[PDB]
């Protein structure tokens, strides 16, 4: 016989290997596939799909539909943001339950940009202006309008256009960031403030809500396949 030599690694079973084994049912007519709409090629594609963020996970509002309703109430112009959010995926309970986050809990790194879209859900007649602000990684949470004003911010007008889209760029030290809580690689903050205030005509309800969405971009990628499934 052809002189062959068995090297180390024979008779072992690598779960992640890729070998050609015997086919149990020879000549079996496999039913041909049809173009059923919605074929998926890669997971990153499901991320580029905007998904509503449950912002208000308060004691009573969490695990209820109210977690998705950010309400602009009738309170004083205090530079206390209406909402603030940490750009730290699994290291923050809010970005975690999004389809975006659901993809990130299966990897170790994440790169690229992300986009937060705010949709106003108030009376047509109602008008006002708000300031959506972004504070790059490592920087302290912008707690005042003036503070938040200095950095990357969009001045979103309610009166004119109903939906704001703020694309958070790639201002990161490491070429690949931690999906985990790390100070070496920590997200940043996305917060909203009252640029102006809310103006409502006649006797139209003085309290409406805003929804939030999050998704990935074409440059968004992931690595090192891991898991977390319990019993």
């Amino acid at each position: 016989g052809l002189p062959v030599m068995n090297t180390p690694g024979s008779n072992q079973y690598l779960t992640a290997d890729n070998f050609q084994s015997p086919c149990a049912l020879p000549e079996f007519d496999v039913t041909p596939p049809i173009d059923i709409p919605g074929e998926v090629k890669n997971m990153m594609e499901l991320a580029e799909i905007d998904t509503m963020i449950p912002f208000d996970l308060s004691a009573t509002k969490k695990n209820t539909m109210e977690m998705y309703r950010v309400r602009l109430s009738d309170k004083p112009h205090t530079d206390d943001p209406i909402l603030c959010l940490s750009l730290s995926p699994a290291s923050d309970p809010r970005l975690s339950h999004t389809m975006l986050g659901e993809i990130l809990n299966y990897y170790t790194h994440w790169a690229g940009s992300l986009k937060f879209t705010f949709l106003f859900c108030g009376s047509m007649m109602a008008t006002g202006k708000l300031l959506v602000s972004y504070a790059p990684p490592g920087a302290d949470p912008p707690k005042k309008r003036k503070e938040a004003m200095l950095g990357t911010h969009v001045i979103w007008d309610i009166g004119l256009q109903s939906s704001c889209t703020m694309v958070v760029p790639w201002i990161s030290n490491t070429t690949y960031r931690q999906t985990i809580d790390d100070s070496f690689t920590e997200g940043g903050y996305i917060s909203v403030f009252y640029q102006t205030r809310i103006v409502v005509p006649l006797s139209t309800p003085r309290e409406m809500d805003i929804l939030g969405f999050v998704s990935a971009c074409n440059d968004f990628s992931v690595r090192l396949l891991r898991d977390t499934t319990h019993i």
């Epitope: 208000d56 308060s58 509002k61 206390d80 943001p81 209406i82 909402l83 603030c84 949470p141 809580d181």
Partner: nanobody, 122 residues
Framework: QVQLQESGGGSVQAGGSLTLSCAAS????????MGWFRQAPGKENEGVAA????????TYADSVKGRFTISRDNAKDTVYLRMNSLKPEDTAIYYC???????????????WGQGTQVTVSS
């Protein structure tokens, strides 16, 4: 998993001082702030007091201003809400939450306690 154990509740008198506390597990208390939210029977999520562990910069609600005192402990990872001089309006099931930080807003937080019932008995 981050845990906040709302401890210091009960039915005291009108003017009766009652301190509150919360054990902050899962993170370095300095990276976060900490505040308080009360909700009267069948009412809404309303703020009371909150301060940032690093800057220790105070902030109270207008109605509670004066009588309530917030103070943080970086050693025991606990907050102390000295609800002094209580009133029948202060009868609201309290809650504590770690902030990003810093101030009393709609929600603006993430980790929420179970809920301790304080009743300003009169």
């Amino acid at each position: 998993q981050v845990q906040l154990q709302e401890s210091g509740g009960g039915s005291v008198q009108a003017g009766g001082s009652l301190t509150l506390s919360c054990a902050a597990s899962g993170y370095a208390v300095s990276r976060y702030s900490m505040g308080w939210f009360r909700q009267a029977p069948g009412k809404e999520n309303e703020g009371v007091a909150a301060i940032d562990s690093s800057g220790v910069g105070t902030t109270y609600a207008d109605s509670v201003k004066g009588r309530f005192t917030i103070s943080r402990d970086n050693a025991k990872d606990t907050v102390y809400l000295r609800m002094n001089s209580l009133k029948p309006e202060d009868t609201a099931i309290y809650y504590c939450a770690s902030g990003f930080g810093l101030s009393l807003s709609r929600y603006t937080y993430a980790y929420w306690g179970q809920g301790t019932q304080v009743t300003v008995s009169s």
